[PDB]
């Protein structure tokens, strides 16, 4: 088992030293939570897990104006697949202020997404494979998270 | 089912877990500070602990700046400390990251794997087994190597 820490600046991606596969965990830690940021474009913040070929295994997008969290997948060159949505962004982060956590458990057939202690969705995968990269995309002007998000992975668990 | 539990532990206090930590689970203590020049411990500057339901120290992690060592031990509820394990050079274990730190403990059933940031500092073979039902972060606000409040995050139901 191993722990790897990644400091992801908004709008950048990072290659994992240890891949995230079935049974592994990744948590994105934000040192802030601004639910008063302007409207997204259309997204305020997104956190992604990528396969080796660049496919979006899991795309999580936070939209304040549409008051929704979107979950989807996409082939590197393909179009967004079947979009999953969950309403009320504020409610998902309820309980903890000034910071937040977004954890993704890779259960093989699904990705379990948890905001702080709340499981927001049991996402049935649309694309499978190990996660080799991660990204945090947003602007300094409208992101709901801190300018740098710390991603921590716990691997070798299985 | 797998779950995430968040606990804010103020220096010198303990918390009872909503979900116990057992084989295959993980606990990580997050500190928003790192003071390798804190006062003199007596002898501990900071300790992070995992307890069984009966009060036993499943794992006692003590950071000592002056003795420059991190100690690992266990003890039954009202018994003597058992066989101590040592890791010399505190600063070295936290090398690479400043201003903060994290201490992760993997419960591997037969051993506790302790990792400081990304570095595994010890494969601690348990002297006492059982589920972890409480955690503690002990220190004075003046001589702790960590922040006044440490955030413990547990990942459970993994197995």
UniProtKB/Swiss-Prot annotation, chain A:
SUPFAM superfamilies: Concanavalin A-like lectins/glucanases (SSF49899). The modification Blocked amino end (Gln) is found at residue 1. Its EC number is 3.1.21.-. Gene3D superfamilies: 2.60.120.200. PROSITE patterns: GALECTIN. Residues 12-155 form the Galectin domain. Signal peptide: none annotated. It is an enzyme of class 3 (hydrolase). It comes from the Eukaryota. Pfam families: Gal-bind_lectin. Disulfide bonds: none annotated. GO terms for biological process: apoptotic process; positive regulation of apoptotic process. GO terms for molecular function: DNA nuclease activity; polysaccharide binding. Detected in the fruiting body. N-acetyl-alpha-neuraminyl-(2->3)-beta-D-galactosyl-(1->4)-beta-D-glucose binds at residues 43, 59, 63, 72, 74, 80, 83. Keywords: Apoptosis, Hydrolase, Lectin, Nuclease. Homodimer. Anti-tumor lectin with DNase activity. Inhibits the growth of several tumor cell lines in vitro. Induces lymphocyte infiltration and necrosis of tumor cells in a mouse tumor model. Induces apoptosis in HeLa cells. Binds N-acetylneuraminyl lactose (N-acetyl-alpha-neuraminyl-(2->3)-beta-D-galactosyl-(1->4)-beta-D-glucose). This is Anti-tumor lectin. It comes from Cyclocybe aegerita.
């Amino acid at each position: 088992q191993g722990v790897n820490i990644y400091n992801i600046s908004a709008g950048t991606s990072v290659d994992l030293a240890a891949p995230v596969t079935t049974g592994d965990i990744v948590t994105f830690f934000s040192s802030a939570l601004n639910l008063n940021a302007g409207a997204g474009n259309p997204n305020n913040t997104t956190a992604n897990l990528f396969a080796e070929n660049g496919a979006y295994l899991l795309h999580i997008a936070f939209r304040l104006q549409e008051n929704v969290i979107i979950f989807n997948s996409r082939q590197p060159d393909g179009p967004w697949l079947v979009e999953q949505r969950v309403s009320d962004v504020a409610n998902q982060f309820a309980g903890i202020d000034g910071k937040a956590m977004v954890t993704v458990f890779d259960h093989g057939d699904k990705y379990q997404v948890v905001i702080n202690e709340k499981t927001v969705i049991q996402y049935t995968k649309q694309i499978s494979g190990l996660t080799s990269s991660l990204s945090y995309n947003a602007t300094e002007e409208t992101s709901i998270f801190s300018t740098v998000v710390e991603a921590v992975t716990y691997t070798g668990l299985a």
